[PDB]
Design a protein around this ligand. Structure first.
Ligand SMILES: *[C@@H]1O[C@H](CO)[C@@H](O)[C@H](O)[C@H]1NC(C)=O
Lengths: 230, 206, 214
């Protein structure tokens, strides 16, 4: 098993530059290649380019030519993606992959196979500043109670960039938890909700707290959720 | 009786492949009845058990596949295609290209040689570069009974830490927590690969 | 470039089923086709190369066939760990190109949503903004229609929906619809309702509240 770790992802303004790195394990870096492929949020896979072997030549997707460059340092077993003149549509999870070739005299091509991929790194291209979320309670009520069960949650509103993580009672409450994917609001900021269904008899005797972490802004918020008095 | 379905594609016989890539040989043939295909390496029968990694055989596609090629795969590979009415064969010559490895190269932490007070933390650092997979060990010179050496060549040593690096570069660390008099002595970062051994010494005095 | 067209874009199946996914090249790619599996939040994993060759360590229930322009991936007997998205890819030329994916999801029985409505928090409201959240919890299948009405007028263009992946325990979906209004606009009205249409319901269900009321 070759393992690859991508780093260097983050928020960058349109027209800006960013360099990603891809550190590979193993001892065959020099005789094989590295490919980069991206995945725009909620979308499919798009090949960005390849260096093959890692001390060899490069090829790029048309959408990236003249703007992105791939290189590698064979003494470090590290490949790089230099991204210049970035656009909003370059927003994506970027993967690197170990790439080998299938050599065969019968055919006029060498099949390239991308077998081991890294965990990915998120590149966001926007004019938006980094911004921590507001966190509001979605209070349990009679309008959120059915059978012996009550729904409650937290609205995590107006943050940038992705991602946010949400936990309940510091990870103790995991049953019946639903945390929705983020949507991009008309403001250009992200919002999501996290909800949980609990016995409505537990309301009163049990405390419910959503723990919200937004790494990009180093924001950490805890919010107790309880019924509204009246 | 057997024939090549594309005899023109059968002119090429010599293939060079860099190590760790995959090789496929094909001998696409026809006949009535449809012939057998078997594979020889250097004129002897060739089976999965003859290389580590094995082989992938695909008779319907007249193919032999060898994943992750290494220098020991170099040689001649013949398909023998046969029915009751006849025989044909094709021999490929495979070269595999690989860089030669070297002994590990070590780099000490700049503090190494150290001194510390009772109860404090000490950390030794050792950067290991190795183009072939190394076994990395932190060792300590001990004394079984006035044996700052042993009836041989052979300073006595115990192993504090051991791992096999997954990468060509490793930053290996030894942490000695809450140090006592006991913890004073000579420490070794050792790295051993196929080709050989390197080591660096580190001293502690408490 | 060479275009790879996958079908179907999605399918629902049970453990034990035989599954067949197809991939069609816009032009001849010989056998230079790979198949990948991807799970949510994870990197793709290689299953098959050269159309029909199983990558080492991949279960033998997976197989591929095809040549030229038509390729198929078959899972002989689907296992719980096989629910994922599957992508074909050609590397006959440069650039290599991917198909658009096939999501294999878990079949289960019809389940009506439990529908809950949340007014804006007093905490949010003080700041000049109002989010109203309608929750459709634990339903199957995924298809559902949610409409907002404010003092009985149908709203349009002021809500956004988000849906979870199939639940880890019960294979259901949950969905949020969030209506966004200014504080001023929120205070100009009394009744807030979300109306839900789903297969598990013989007629639409309405959940509502009256602003500032208990
Ligand atoms: C392979 O075949 C060539 C040509 O006949 C010969 O010169 C060579 O020595 C053979 N190699 C081995 C390893 O037998």
């Amino acid at each position: 098993e070759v393992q690859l770790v991508e780093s260097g992802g983050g928020l960058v303004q349109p027209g800006g530059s960013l360099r990603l790195s891809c550190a590979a394990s193993g001892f065959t870096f020099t005789s094989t290649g590295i490919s980069w492929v991206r995945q725009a949020p909620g979308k499919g896979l798009e090949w960005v380019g390849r260096i093959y072997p890692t001390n060899g030549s490069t090829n790029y997707a048309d959408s990236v030519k003249g703007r992105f460059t791939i290189s590698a340092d064979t003494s470090k077993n590290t490949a790089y993606l230099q991204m210049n003149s970035l656009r909003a549509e370059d927003t994506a999870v970027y993967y690197c992959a170990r790439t080998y070739g299938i050599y065969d005299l019968y055919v006029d091509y060498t099949e390239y196979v991308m077998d081991y991929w890294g965990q990915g790194t998120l590149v966001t291209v926007s004019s938006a500043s980094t911004k921590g979320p507001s966190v509001f309670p979605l209070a349990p009520s009679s309008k959120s109670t059915s059978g012996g069960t009550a729904a409650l949650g937290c609205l995590v509103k107006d943050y940038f960039p992705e991602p946010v993580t949400v936990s309940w009672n510091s990870g103790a409450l995991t049953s019946g938890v639903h945390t929705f994917p983020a949507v991009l609001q008309s403001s250009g900021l992200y919002s999501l909700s996290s909800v949980v269904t609990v016995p409505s008899s537990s309301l009163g005797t049990q405390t419910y707290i959503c723990n919200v972490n937004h790494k990009p802004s180093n924001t950490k918020v805890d919010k107790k959720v309880e019924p509204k008095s009246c | 009786a057997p024939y090549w379905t594309r005899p023109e594609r059968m002119d090429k016989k010599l293939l060079a492949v860099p190590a760790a890539n995959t090789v496929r040989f094909r001998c696409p043939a026809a006949g009535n009845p449809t012939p057998s295909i078997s594979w020889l390496k250097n004129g002897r029968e060739f089976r999965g058990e003859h290389r580590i990694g094995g082989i992938k055989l695909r008779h319907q596609q007249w193919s032999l596949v060898m994943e992750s090629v290494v220098p020991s795969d170099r040689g001649n590979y013949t398909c023998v295609v046969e029915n009751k009415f006849g025989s044909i064969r094709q021999t490929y010559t495979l070269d595999v290209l690989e860089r030669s490895p070297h002994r590990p190269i070590l780099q000490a932490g700049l503090p190494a040689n150290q001194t510390a007070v009772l109860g404090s933390d000490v950390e030794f650092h050792c950067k290991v570069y190795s183009d072939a997979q190394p076994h990395i060990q932190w060792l300590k010179h001990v004394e079984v009974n006035g044996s700052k050496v042993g009836p041989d060549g052979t300073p006595y040593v115990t192993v504090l830490k051991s791992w096999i690096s997954e990468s060509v570069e490793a930053d290996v660390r030894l942490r000695l927590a809450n140090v006592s008099e006991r913890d004073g002595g000579e420490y070794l970062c050792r790295a051993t690969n196929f080709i050989g051994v390197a080591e660096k010494a580190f001293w502690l005095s408490v | 470039d060479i275009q790879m067209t996958q079908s179907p874009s999605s399918l629902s199946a049970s453990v034990g089923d035989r599954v067949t996914i197809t991939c069609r090249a816009s032009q001849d790619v010989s056998t230079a086709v790979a198949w990948y599996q991807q799970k949510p939040g994870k990197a793709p994993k290689l299953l098959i190369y050269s159309a029909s060759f199983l990558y080492s360590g991949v279960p033998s229930r997976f197989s591929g066939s095809g040549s030229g322009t038509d390729f198929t991936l078959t899972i002989s007997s689907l296992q719980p760990e096989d629910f994922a998205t599957y992508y074909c890819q050609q590397s006959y030329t440069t650039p290599p190109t991917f198909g658009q994916g096939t999501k294999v999801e878990i079949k289960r029985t019809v389940a009506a949503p439990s529908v809950f409505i949340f007014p804006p928090s007093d905490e949010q409201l003080k700041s000049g903004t109002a989010s109203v959240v309608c929750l459709l919890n634990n339903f199957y299948p995924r298809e559902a229609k949610v409409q907002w009405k404010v003092d009985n007028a149908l709203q349009s263009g002021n809500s956004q929906e988000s849906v979870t992946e199939q639940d880890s325990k019960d294979s259901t979906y949950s969905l949020s619809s969030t209506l966004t209004l200014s504080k001023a606009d929120y205070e100009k009205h009394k009744v807030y309702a979300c109306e839900v249409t789903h297969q598990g319901l013989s007629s639409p269900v309405t959940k509502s509240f009256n602003r500032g009321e208990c």
